[PDB]
Design a protein around this ligand. Structure first.
Ligand SMILES: OC[C@H]1O[C@@H](O[C@H]2[C@H](O)[C@@H](O)[C@@H](O)O[C@@H]2CO)[C@H](O)[C@@H](O)[C@@H]1O
Length: 302
């Protein structure tokens, strides 16, 4: 399809771009430190997903050239988001996110990524140096309407519950795609040293979702049918911004009064530890001709 927004970090992108919050990323959703403190551009240290590589002729010595660099998104004890200038700090969450924008504007992108059929691409790689704690829930990728709901979510870690249940949950370390109602559509183990490639097709007209997945250099394959996602609101209230990064929920603190334990935005246990995940292959396309499945192939989608 036609690329509507490209979040595949250029090889020439720098910390200075992130700190200026310029295209393609709005960088405001983070703690008070500079964007480049939480999000690192990995250069040639980490090979990004091979799906969007270019290929050389001849095919030795180098078969492939990377067309992007991977991003390392970190959260730590300072990763407390304050809404606006004056909001109550979100002390229950630890979060660092990048939001899709064009011309310095998330607003202008809403109608573009929110009409017709749109494929949301993203690949993730486990960070071995700052391990995620799968005792907690992490919301990694989502499209969020103004009400803060998620049209879909890529999640990993044990889902937050009040009261606390057995932890870790079964398959806590499985990546999960959820619908807007939080139903698990697809789940797969978050194996290390592997690029986990996804596309989620949103049909904004019919309010459906379809999940596509592969590992490493393998082309995306469909792993769900076209599924209804009918809890999404009608019209503009069902559209919203594309986020990727880490949004870590807390655990219940029984020391808190019962009346606030559900308010994970402001209450709950968060250890003062650092955690990361790596991203590549993050972009949004329409479905003209078909879905980009990797390796310079398109596949027609019904
Ligand atoms: O309110 C609890 C839910 O918070 C969700 O995070 C939202 C938040 O509510 C919004 O105000 C805004 O800050 O965006 C956040 C991320 O979309 C969270 O996703 C849910 O899991 C919580 O139940």
């Amino acid at each position: 399809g036609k690329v509507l927004w490209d979040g595949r970090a250029p090889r020439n992108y720098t910390s200075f771009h992130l700190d200026a919050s310029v295209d393609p990323y709005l960088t405001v959703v983070k703690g008070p430190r500079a964007a480049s403190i939480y999000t690192r551009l990995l250069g040639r240290e980490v090979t990004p997903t091979p799906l969007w590589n270019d290929r050389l002729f001849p095919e030795v010595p180098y078969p492939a050239v990377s067309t992007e660099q991977a991003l390392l998104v970190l959260i730590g004890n300072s990763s407390v988001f304050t809404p606006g200038s004056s909001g109550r700090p979100q002390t229950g969450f630890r979060r660092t996110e990048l939001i899709a924008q064009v011309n310095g504007s998330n607003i202008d992108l809403i109608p573009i990524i929110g009409k017709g059929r749109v494929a949301f691409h993203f690949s993730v790689l486990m960070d071995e140096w700052h391990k995620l704690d799968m005792i907690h829930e992490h919301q990694l990728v989502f499209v969020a309407p103004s009400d803060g709901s998620h049209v879909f979510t890529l999640q990993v870690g044990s889902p937050f519950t009040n009261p606390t249940g057995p932890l870790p949950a079964p398959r806590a370390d499985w990546l999960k795609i959820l619908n807007h109602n939080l139903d698990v559509l697809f789940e797969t183990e978050f194996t290390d040293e592997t690029w986990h490639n996804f596309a989620v097709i949103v049909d904004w007209e019919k309010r459906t979702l379809q999940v596509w997945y592969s590992q490493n250099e393998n082309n995306l394959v469909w792993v769900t049918p076209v599924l209804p996602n009918e809890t999404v609101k009608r019209g503009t209230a069902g559209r919203g911004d594309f986020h990727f990064g880490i949004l870590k929920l807390p655990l219940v603190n029984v020391a808190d009064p019962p009346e606030v334990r559900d308010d994970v935005v402001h209450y709950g246990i968060q250890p003062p530890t650092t955690h990361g995940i790596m991203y590549s292959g993050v972009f949004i396309e329409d479905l003209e001709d078909g879905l980009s499945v990797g390796n310079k192939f398109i596949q027609e989608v019904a």
